[PDB]
Design an enzyme around this catalytic site. Sequence first.
Site, short mmCIF file in Angstrom:
data_model
loop_
_atom_site.label_atom_id
_atom_site.label_comp_id
_atom_site.label_asym_id
_atom_site.label_seq_id
_atom_site.Cartn_x
_atom_site.Cartn_y
_atom_site.Cartn_z
N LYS A 70 40.01 46.77 33.20
CA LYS A 70 40.19 47.07 34.61
C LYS A 70 41.55 47.74 34.78
CE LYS A 70 40.26 44.73 39.16
NZ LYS A 70 40.22 43.39 39.82
N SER A 148 37.06 42.43 43.29
CA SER A 148 37.66 43.74 43.02
C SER A 148 37.35 44.33 41.64
CB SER A 148 39.18 43.66 43.21
OG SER A 148 39.77 42.72 42.33
N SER A 172 37.30 37.80 42.32
CA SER A 172 37.16 39.17 41.82
C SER A 172 36.46 39.44 40.49
CB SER A 172 38.51 39.87 41.86
OG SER A 172 38.81 40.22 43.20
#
EC number: 3.5.2.12
Length: 483
Positions: A70, A148, A172
């Site tokens: 990420k 996220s 997330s």
Amino acid sequence: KVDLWQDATAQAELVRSGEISRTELLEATIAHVQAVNPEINAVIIPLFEKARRESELASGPFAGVPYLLKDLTVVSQGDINTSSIKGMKESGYRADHDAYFVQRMRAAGFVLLGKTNTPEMGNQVTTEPEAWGATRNPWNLGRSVGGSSGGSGAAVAAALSPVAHGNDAAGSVRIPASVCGVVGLKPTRGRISPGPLVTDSDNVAGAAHEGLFARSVRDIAALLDVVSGHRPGDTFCAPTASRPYAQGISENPGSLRVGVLTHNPVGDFALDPECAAAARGAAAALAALGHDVNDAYPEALGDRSFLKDYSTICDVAIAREIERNGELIGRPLTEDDVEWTSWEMVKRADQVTGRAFAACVDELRYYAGKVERWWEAGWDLLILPTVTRQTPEIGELMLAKGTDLEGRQSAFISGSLQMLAFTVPFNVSGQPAISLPIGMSSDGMPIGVQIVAAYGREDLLLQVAAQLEGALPWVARRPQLLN
């Protein structure tokens, strides 16, 4: 043409076995990415050249197996780092080092294939940043992938990689896992180091956890064995397991006291019936397995007043994060470098005093205590839906610059609140929580089932997860994007 639907453990074996070459697997994966990724915009920063270089040198239990990172918190040496901040993407900034997480994965044999999309500074439960555009769901391109860590969730769901990294501050990792039909684990607080960097104001006072994505429980167990452990400067730490997780996953935990939650204890919105039914089905399977299953839950879950305190901490965290990124490029970031919701928090942060910030952290600690007392009382596991509503359509959760939020996170209101209501309590308590892709909505969208164990008990969690994986296997299902 390698079968990219095999998990990391299987793909590693194919290479070790010699059945396929490292370059074959990698090139086959790269090709797949180039063909599928354009449709979902999951991988925003390709790193094929690095992947190819590491592949040649790679060595370990997963030598040659690709993985995605990420673009937030953890960074990779010499690669673009935007954190989905417009001003940062334009600066072309590149990290100067490898986070401990990255080093551990490389030492294990994994090859860094690229970075995945995320909302700006991971501040949303959907992945539709202005900087990189929206990431779309492989199961339905018109739907959100959650957030996220939406990019990593979608990437694994579309087989762009068997495993991926992500972080979880309000759910997330678990949220995108639930929404994209993959396994997502938020381990015990302090299990995985986010260092050496110190970001998000002590990782949002401990609420932000690095986590893992995969399509099998065994892959998660193996990943934990790779990236876990105390590193220099790490603020939090988790209890030590007696043996490697890859090993303990097959142990029989015996009959555990299991509590099932199939309604919203706060009472401020109705839990989606299909989400509830998925958790109910999982509880039934556990009962059939011999566990002592009952309708019960930590009384603390009926209160979400802590979210206000958490929001205040988040305001400060984002504000200071905007400052940290500015220092990275050598210039203060302005209202023109970030999304309006992010700048709003900068203003709110200025109204927070030292005593107030300290008080909010204490509120989190007190709530964590109320939650953990349920396990202290004898309960071993809590089973509940990962999310409380049907998956939103792209654009649904992103508010117009003129929305009247008024003193609170945009992710903590209306449509966004229902995405993280059942996950955020455990970011506060710091207990290990995993989302298993056991359910499907009536319109073909994945529904995750969440299991929460006592602080530090990923061993019991993975054991029961493996049991559910065997009782309600999901590997047979694949997103339409893959025909």
